[PDB]
């Protein structure tokens, strides 16, 4: 079997890779908010495609939102916020 899980979400393909992807993104606050949202959403899709290619972007983000409740991911976020 194969499934997206906490090892992958905390691994080198995970949240740190998403942070490194987001370092170059700098929206203009005076522009259209829906246009800025579209620009952000496809960077989410790009990171999800690299991180787990089997699944749709919608299901990937649902699975990440589910896996945020795990204690291992919470401990990772506590360390990562420093």
């Amino acid at each position: 079997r194969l499934a997206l899980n906490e090892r992958i979400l905390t691994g080198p393909k995970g949240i740190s890779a998403l942070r490194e992807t987001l370092k170059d993104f700098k929206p203009n606050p005076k522009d259209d908010p829906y246009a800025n949202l579209e620009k952000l959403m496809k960077k989410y899709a790009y990171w999800g495609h690299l991180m787990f290619p089997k699944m749709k972007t919608e299901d990937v983000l649902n699975r990440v939102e589910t896996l945020g409740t795990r204690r291992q991911v919470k401990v990772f976020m506590i360390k990562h916020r420093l």
């Binding site: 949240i15 998403l18 942070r19 987001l22 370092k23 993104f25 929206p27 606050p29 908010p33 829906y34 800025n36 949202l37 579209e38 952000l40 959403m41 496809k42 989410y44 899709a45 790009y46 495609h49 690299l50 290619p53 089997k54 699944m55 749709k56 972007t57 919608e58 299901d59 983000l61 649902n62 990440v64 939102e65 945020g68 976020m77 916020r81």
Partner: protein, 656 residues
Amino acid sequence: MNVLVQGAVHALGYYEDGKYSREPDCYESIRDLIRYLREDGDDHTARIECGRHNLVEQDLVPMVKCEDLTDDEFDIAIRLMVNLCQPAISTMRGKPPADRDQWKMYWELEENLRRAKTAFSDAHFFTAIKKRIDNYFIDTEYEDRDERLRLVVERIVLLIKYVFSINPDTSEGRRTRIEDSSHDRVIIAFLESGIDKTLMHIANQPREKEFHVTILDIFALILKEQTAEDLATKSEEVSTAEQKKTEEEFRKIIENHVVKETQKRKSFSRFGGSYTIKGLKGISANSSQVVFKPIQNVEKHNFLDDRKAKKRAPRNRRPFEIDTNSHFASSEVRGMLRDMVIRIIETCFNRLMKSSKTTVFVQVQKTSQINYFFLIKFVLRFVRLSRQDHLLERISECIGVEAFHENNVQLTEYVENATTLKGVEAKSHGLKAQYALGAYNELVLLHRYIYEHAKEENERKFAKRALEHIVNVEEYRELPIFIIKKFSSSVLSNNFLRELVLTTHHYMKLVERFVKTGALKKVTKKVKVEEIDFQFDSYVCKFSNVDVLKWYVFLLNDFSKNSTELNQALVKMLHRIAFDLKLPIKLYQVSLFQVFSKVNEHFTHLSKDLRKSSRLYELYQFGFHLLKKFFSKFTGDLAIEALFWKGPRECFEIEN
């Protein structure tokens, strides 16, 4: 066995066109059929053979229409017809089909009942049985009545209930949502016979209590397919306006088709090639992204998400609707039903409800509870929407504080049983909970209407004391959070969740007005009981929990087919947390941004005037303001925090 059934069935008579001709020994043939049905086993062989031969449509109903039919012939025909028109689960002794082979027998029983319903689309049958009802109740005094005729009258009344509780039929064809149902033809024949006036007369008598629960069931089953909004507006038309309206409808259809086809045929491109997107990485090492169609611009790329198969939930945990066959019937049927509803309110309602409420929850049978709550909800909504304010005297059985008390008790018990049990039993109890919740919502709205628009100050004071009791006591103020924390899509329908959202909307408006006028300042709380100051922001802050906001984001996905009232309720609840508590960090969430993306794509297809004309403009504007507030101070770690639901200390540490 079934050679006996085949011998008995074909020995009755034959239907010439316009006349049924009878053999002399119909009485003994019907006795033998009743005897076989009594001795049938768990295979239900004799019953299934009778369903195969179609006794009710072919023989028994045309036999009952005959004028020469004697007393005993009529009596034993009604006995056999009642036994054949019994429902399927009642035949199976209440157990649902738990097995692959049990379901086959259940379906075989059900189709025979569905086939038989069009036999009762003739007024002559109801005319034939109305005379026996009139003989017992009107033409015989209470001292001189006979138990034989009493039992026959009980059989006739139960037969009417069994007839109106038959399900619709799919096999005859598919029918549009804007014409008369097949149920409506039986309703037309039933009302044209005038037997309903006799039933109303019987229901008015205090002495005849044993028929009252069944008569309540009959009128609820008549109003099964309707809503109060269909009947509340008085019907009127002019054919000039109708012709102009229909021409404009087809103009809309034609213009939509032409625009869509020209867009689609202009989308295509001629030749091919293959291309590299320099600057985007591939899965394999040192690789750039590769595409195999002539893309207009790099942002049009999709990473082939169209290929990938969607993940499904397991079969125990998918959402489910409950379907009522609901349609906009013709003006004739709507006028007849409006007259019938007004006559019920004038002649029956107070006595019928008073007689029923002592008994409905004591009985073994489940279904009359659902019928009770349905009839309450329908009648109170009809009175409020039709603004027939002089009828408010006639529904005085339901206006007291005791109505709120008893409704709350029954609703609480249904919610606990539906949450704790498992399977079809849990779904069965949750179905009762849904109707109880709807009746509660109508109670709240009717009391507000009385307090706003009644002419008598005594009536206004009586309504105001009940409203103050609802606002004050903790059980009524804590009910929405209590239900929302126990909601589960395995055992409760989507209709329940929509009803709960609308109920919460109306209740919170009532609490806000009673705080704003200063009538609510201090509140009793259990410990002993002690009184503490009340704050409306402290009350609103309870709904900002994640376990509540999940379902609001869940229902906002269906924005393109929700009603405008439901869309307003969802946007208002989010708007309160966004701009009254002034806490947008709890709403910064990716699963809401997906809804905003869908709304923005929907609004791209409209000109700047049509966008302001659209019904979804409130949701568009709210999404605009929240996204501008988000991007005013964008950072990458904030974009990471958008992936997770944020608790209270998480909000404090993100803010500070």
